[PDB]
Nucleic acid binder design. Structure first.
Ligand code: HPA
Ligand code: HPA
Lengths: 338, 338
DNA sequence: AACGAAAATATTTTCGT
DNA sequence: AACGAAAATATTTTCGT
């Protein structure tokens, strides 16, 4: 069809291309004629044909876990922006932590020739780290690891440990000592890593967390609902609680309220993520903020680099969580004593 | 590179293709040899080259508004599923209700030759309905209209009017008569249309809604926060409130609580959407449920049809909202009197 | 019976003059 | 000075025998 435009403008295709891409000088009239034909015929250059020759689709892929979760959704939407303001088109794929699903997507992606790969899989078993190496060619960056798990990728690091620690400290400094904790999957950095940062602070404070007080969650509100229930559904209960993620916390709040508890008069609760609608939780949620836009942009920007400037060496950039004081934490029994 | 595989297997490319696509019979050994070469070379067929010839990218596009909003996020994630379980790859693009942005995406999409187009733009000014016609060729379906706004598309209809009406009725039947309402943008079906369904029920009940009691929102929690504030920040206040969407409602709840109000002992609140985490709102949110998966799948399924079975005529399928009774609405002053 | 030669798909870019 | 001819990119598919 570039033919059809060309013969209607009475010029070569080679010319038609040139005016379209401003790849070289074309006479005014000539350039106008082409436009005219271009308009009449109603022409839309084939991006596929072109990519075939230029060798790049100007389109990147997202091998994600899930897209509904607040945490996720925000990151992605940020990524989309960056892609768009820089020409890239975005292919989104959710693996659901399912190997086959991830193997399939990884393939469709390579075949559809994505220019780069944005990886957010949550849990990375060896089998997965393997598949990834098989694609060490297509440039990529994992955005959800605690450290550099490999050498064939660029990685961005959230410092979820120094966050957990920050969370613990606050509680401590608020006068708390009987603290419980509902963490997210341990096979996750955002789970196991935040937890540990937490426990460190606990140890330096000589605080012990009774195991009847640590309840695993899956980051979904329902899980936090059941964890809170268990923690308070017992003889001795803590005076404060550290929740792995905001959306689980929102589920902790519910149960608390459902059992006549008052947060934070009865129980203080601190979460982690700082989701967009956190402030509108009842009460406004005190939590640890994860820079999600900066995560998105910073990842997209690493990929581009490697992409354009053909970099080959691994790169890892750190990002930092920070505390956000809202209205869900109350002073503790030992506050005055410090 | 299909060449490289072929000459290593000592067979034509034509053969290499055939075994790959099982497009025709190949001898066992021959088929195995090809596989072998295929494996050694580490070959990934070029989906672009192929699409060039077959004329279809086996990939559809989402011209969305935003992707973070709960309402949206859910629909999309549902769409992704359908795409994936049927071979399609998903290109997501958020227009942000920005014409240029929408014009740009619409183009990149046509150029990148999407096989079909899923449209969710929220507000459709004439200028936009126009651009859309310019692409009446590429098969598409709008999923967010109240009726069939045009003839060059398939449409799925939510019946947001019969929902608003349902919402009103409940309140009425609960013993309420002093009701306020924070609706979503009127330029939206989910805004203007739910509102009207509401007001109808109000009229048949001879209830008048004092204008100091109707406050527009933008579907974002913050807006609901300010609307509730205004409604209750006044002399005479209603005994119940109908909120256009759940996430705004969650913002209504906050303010209510912030002003010492008790939902629903003080104010009953009913929303619309039935988002995944609605039940974990404090209190568990009574709302009108919008079948979002069914929306996604049903749209994807219309598109496919038109796609494969080369249909040309418009099609419109209706979907139905339904009431979900939770714990945010209390009996009203006139309950006993009916 | 099982396979190949070559045309085709819609572009870009190299040398031309 | 301003433009074109033709090779190339990585596949599928038509007739062959
Ligand atoms: O895996 C996760 N899911 C949801 N929210 C989260 N916040 C941190 N990690 C996660
Ligand atoms: O446009 C919308 N945005 C967010 N939530 C919604 N629920 C219905 N319509 C909308």
């Amino acid at each position: 069809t570039i033919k059809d435009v060309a013969k209607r403008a009475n010029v070569s295709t080679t010319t038609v291309s040139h005016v379209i891409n401003k790849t070289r000088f074309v006479a005014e009239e000539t350039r106008n004629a082409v436009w005219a034909a271009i308009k009449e015929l109603h022409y839309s250059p084939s991006a596929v044909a072109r990519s075939l020759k230029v060798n790049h689709t100007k389109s990147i892929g997202l091998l994600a876990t899930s897209s509904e979760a607040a945490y996720f959704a925000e990151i992605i939407e940020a990524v989309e922006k960056n892609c768009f303001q820089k020409g890239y088109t975005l292919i989104l794929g959710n693996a659901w932590n399912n190997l086959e699903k991830q193997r399939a997507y990884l393939s469709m992606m390579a075949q559809k020739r994505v220019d780069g790969l944005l990886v957010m899989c949550s849990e990375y078993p060896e089998p997965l780290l393997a598949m990834l190496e098989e694609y060490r060619h297509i440039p990529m960056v994992v955005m959800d690891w605690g450290e550099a798990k490999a050498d064939f990728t660029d990685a961005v690091i959230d410092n979820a440990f120094e966050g957990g620690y920050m969370a613990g400290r606050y509680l401590i400094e608020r006068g708390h000592r009987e603290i419980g904790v509902i963490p997210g999957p341990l096979e996750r950095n955002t789970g196991a890593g935040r937890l540990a940062g937490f426990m460190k602070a606990m140890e330096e404070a000589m605080i012990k967390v009774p195991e009847s007080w640590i309840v695993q969650g899956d980051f979904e509100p329902e899980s936090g609902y059941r964890a809170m229930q268990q923690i308070l559904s017992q003889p001795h209960r803590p005076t404060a609680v550290f929740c792995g993620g905001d959306i689980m916390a929102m589920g902790a709040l519910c149960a608390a309220d459902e059992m006549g508890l008052r947060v934070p008069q009865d129980v203080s609760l601190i979460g982690y993520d700082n989701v967009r609608n956190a402030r509108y939780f009842t009460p406004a949620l005190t939590t640890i903020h994860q820079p999600k836009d900066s995560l998105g942009e910073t990842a997209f920007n690493m990929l581009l680099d490697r992409i354009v400037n053909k970099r080959e060496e691994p790169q890892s950039i750190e990002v930092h969580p920070r505390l956000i004081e809202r209205r869900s934490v109350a002073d503790g029994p030992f506050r005055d004593y410090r």
